[PDB]
Design a protein around this motif. Structure first.
Motif, mmCIF file in Angstrom:
data_model
loop_
_atom_site.group_PDB
_atom_site.id
_atom_site.type_symbol
_atom_site.label_atom_id
_atom_site.label_comp_id
_atom_site.label_asym_id
_atom_site.label_seq_id
_atom_site.Cartn_x
_atom_site.Cartn_y
_atom_site.Cartn_z
ATOM 1 N N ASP A 30 0.823 -1.205 0.000
ATOM 2 C CA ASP A 30 0.000 0.000 0.000
ATOM 3 C C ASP A 30 0.860 1.258 0.000
ATOM 4 N N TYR A 31 1.929 1.273 0.800
ATOM 5 C CA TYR A 31 2.831 2.422 0.806
ATOM 6 C C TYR A 31 3.532 2.578 -0.539
ATOM 7 N N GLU A 32 3.955 1.462 -1.139
ATOM 8 C CA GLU A 32 4.571 1.526 -2.461
ATOM 9 C C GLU A 32 3.588 2.062 -3.495
ATOM 10 N N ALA A 33 2.327 1.634 -3.416
ATOM 11 C CA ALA A 33 1.310 2.142 -4.328
ATOM 12 C C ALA A 33 1.042 3.622 -4.099
ATOM 13 C CB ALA A 33 0.018 1.340 -4.173
ATOM 14 N N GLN A 71 2.929 9.315 -10.265
ATOM 15 C CA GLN A 71 2.068 9.450 -11.435
ATOM 16 C C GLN A 71 1.405 10.822 -11.480
ATOM 17 N N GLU A 72 0.947 11.320 -10.329
ATOM 18 C CA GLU A 72 0.341 12.645 -10.283
ATOM 19 C C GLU A 72 1.354 13.750 -10.545
ATOM 20 N N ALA A 73 2.625 13.530 -10.185
ATOM 21 C CA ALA A 73 3.644 14.559 -10.374
ATOM 22 C C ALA A 73 3.760 14.988 -11.832
ATOM 23 C CB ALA A 73 4.993 14.054 -9.864
ATOM 24 N N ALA A 74 3.588 14.057 -12.770
ATOM 25 C CA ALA A 74 3.648 14.365 -14.194
ATOM 26 C C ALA A 74 2.293 14.717 -14.789
ATOM 27 C CB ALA A 74 4.239 13.181 -14.966
ATOM 28 N N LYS A 75 1.209 14.135 -14.269
ATOM 29 C CA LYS A 75 -0.121 14.493 -14.746
ATOM 30 C C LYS A 75 -0.444 15.951 -14.449
ATOM 31 N N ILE A 76 0.011 16.463 -13.300
ATOM 32 C CA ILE A 76 -0.198 17.872 -12.983
ATOM 33 C C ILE A 76 0.452 18.758 -14.035
#
Lengths: 51, 55
Positions: free
Chosen positions: B9-12, B19-24
């Protein structure tokens, strides 16, 4: 009035049964330990998972 | 199960942050392109109208 051999026969058998139960009590002790360890593990796991 | 899978869960969670760092950046770049195109088109139409009015 009372049979001297009957008392010895009862006492020896009772002592043997108690000795077996003490060894057999480790089995009930382990069962109770598992039953309590379920909650012991849960008490830490729930809070850890929530955090 | 929960304690064992807490590592997954922590890895996810780390993966979702990545993933959000680039989607932003990507969504903001798309909005940038849209807004720049709209402003440029509006101002170019204004420039054509201004050329006619100046004539």
């Amino acid at each position: 009035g009372i049979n001297p051999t009957l008392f010895i026969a009862q006492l020896i058998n009772f002592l043997l049964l108690i000795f077996i139960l003490r060894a057999l009590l480790y089995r009930p002790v382990m069962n109770l330990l598992n039953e309590r360890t379920r909650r012991i593990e849960e008490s830490v796991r729930d809070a850890e998972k929530v955090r | 199960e929960q304690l064992a899978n807490a590592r997954r869960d922590y890895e996810a969670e780390i993966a979702r942050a990545r993933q959000e760092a680039a989607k932003i950046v990507a969504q903001a770049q798309e909005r940038a392109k849209q807004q720049e195109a709209e402003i440029i088109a509006q101002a170019r139409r204004e420039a054509e109208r201004l050329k006619e009015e100046a004539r």
